[PDB]
Structure 1
Amino acid sequence: KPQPIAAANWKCNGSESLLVPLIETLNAATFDHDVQCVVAPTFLHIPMTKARLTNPKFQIAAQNAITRSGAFTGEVSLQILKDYGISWVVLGHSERRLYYGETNEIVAEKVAQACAAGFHVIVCVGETNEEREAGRTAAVVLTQLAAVAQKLSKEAWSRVVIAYEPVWAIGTGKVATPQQAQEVHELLRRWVRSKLGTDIAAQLRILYGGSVTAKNARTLYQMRDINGFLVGGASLKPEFVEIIEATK
């Protein structure tokens, strides 16, 4: 098992009065085992987070970005993020895929650009309730991953992280059973092994996301192909600390 990752996706949430204490708790929590922590605040809150977050085990990521600077009102580019000293980015979140027209190809574009820019990337893949019921899970996630891999060189994979978040488990409280997560993660790593080798597939981090809580993190991490979590809701609470502890 490679170094685990505990990522917090605050999504479209937060206020100064809410984030200050939360960041404080994060700064006092001293984890000893090897673990990479990542917090993803909104663009407007990256500045204050990067100013107060002092825990050396933590890194700050953006929740999204576009490939180049220019006439794109309202968007933020990888170049602007880089000049600010941010080197982690979440791309292809299902919410962006479903609501803001981010197609497999658009996502693959963003990931390729981010990798070249030197970013560490968390790419989200995942199937919907109807896609699973129709028995198309495997086809869906592999097609999503394949579009991304097609634009990457072998060396870029060292900066790539996979996040599997079944849409039917987002903000629904319906977490996948450990066996359910294991199965898909297993599928993902095997495809990567058969395609890029054992070395890369062995070092690759596949994170699980979707109604993760301190009450089920430990059990989910027990599985051999789960390398951590991408946490939403519970990431805005001191509970996140316990979830990081479950990656021991």
Structure 2
Amino acid sequence: KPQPIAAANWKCNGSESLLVPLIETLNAATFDHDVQCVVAPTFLHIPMTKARLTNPKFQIAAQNAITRSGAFTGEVSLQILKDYGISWVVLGHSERRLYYGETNEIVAEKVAQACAAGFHVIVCVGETNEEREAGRTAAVVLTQLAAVAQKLSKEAWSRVVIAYEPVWAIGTGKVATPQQAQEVHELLRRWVRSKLGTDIAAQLRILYGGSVTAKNARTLYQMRDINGFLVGGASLKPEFVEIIEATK
């Protein structure tokens, strides 16, 4: 199993009074094993987080980016992030695909540019409840992944991380079962193995997202093809520390 990643997506949340004590807790936490931790604050909070997060095992990521600076009021480009020292970015999150029109192609465009620019990218994929019920889970996530892969070169994959978040598990409290999750992870890794190879497939990190907590992390990590988590609400709480330890 390649090096695990425990990523925290704080979404559109945060305040200074809230965030200072949380960062101190992350600084105080010590992790012996090899694990890559990432925290993703809102653009506005990246400066204070960068300034205070001193734990060597952590890296800061953006929650989104557009491919070019310029006349795009309200947005933040990959270039503006690089210049500020941020080298990790979350792209294609289900909430962006559903509410802000990011199609498979727009997400593929962002990922391609982010890799070219030297970033480590966490690409999100996932089916909706109706897509699951219609029995289209495989078609949906592989079409999402295929869009991104058609633009990538073999070596860009060293900087690619895949996060599987079932949309029916987001904010719902309805976590998938290790077997449902494992079932999808193994399908995604199998696809990659036949297009790009065993070496690329073996090193690829595929994370699970969707109602993860200290109570179900360890069992989820036990599955063969699950390499870590993209955590939502539980990441804005001390419990996030126990989730990282579950990657031992």
Q: CA deviation at 1:204?
A: 0.1
Write the distance in 1 (CA, Å) between the matches of 2:39 and 2:243. Answer: 13
The 3-state SS of whatever aligns with 2:121 is: strand
Q: CA deviation at 1:175?
A: 0.3
Structure 1 vs Structure 2 CA RMSD: 0.2
Write the distance in 2 (CA, Å) between the matches of 1:30 and 1:205. Answer: 22
The one-character-per-residue Cα deviations of 1:11-46 (angstroms, maximum 9, x if unpaired) are: 000000000000000000000100000000000000
The one-character-per-residue Cα deviations of 1:160-212 (angstroms, maximum 9, x if unpaired) are: 00000000000000000000000000000000000000000000000000000
The 3-state SS of whatever aligns with 1:23 is: helix
The one-character-per-residue Cα deviations of 1:121-160 (angstroms, maximum 9, x if unpaired) are: 0000000000000000000000000000000000000000
Write the distance in 2 (CA, Å) between the matches of 1:30 and 1:222. Answer: 22
The one-character-per-residue Cα deviations of 1:35-73 (angstroms, maximum 9, x if unpaired) are: 000000000000000000000000000000000000000
The 3-state SS of whatever aligns with 2:163 is: strand
Please report the TM-score for the alignment, with normalisation by the length of structure 2: 1.00
Write the distance in 2 (CA, Å) between the matches of 1:200 and 1:246. Answer: 25
Write the distance in 2 (CA, Å) between the matches of 1:188 and 1:44. Answer: 34
Q: After TM superposition, where is structure 1 displaced by more than 4 Å over at least 4 residues in a row? A: none
Q: CA deviation at 1:83?
A: 0.0
The one-character-per-residue Cα deviations of 1:198-227 (angstroms, maximum 9, x if unpaired) are: 000000000000000000000000000000
The 3-state SS of whatever aligns with 2:224 is: coil
Quote the residue 1:169 is aligned against. 169
Q: CA deviation at 1:245?
A: 0.3
The 3-state SS of whatever aligns with 1:33 is: coil
The 3-state SS of whatever aligns with 1:50 is: helix
Write the distance in 2 (CA, Å) between the matches of 1:88 and 1:31. Answer: 21
Q: CA deviation at 1:102?
A: 0.1
Q: CA deviation at 1:105?
A: 0.1
Identical-residue share of aligned pairs (%)? 100
Are 1:21 and 2:40 counterparts? Answer: no
Please report the TM-score for the alignment, with normalisation by the length of structure 1: 1.00
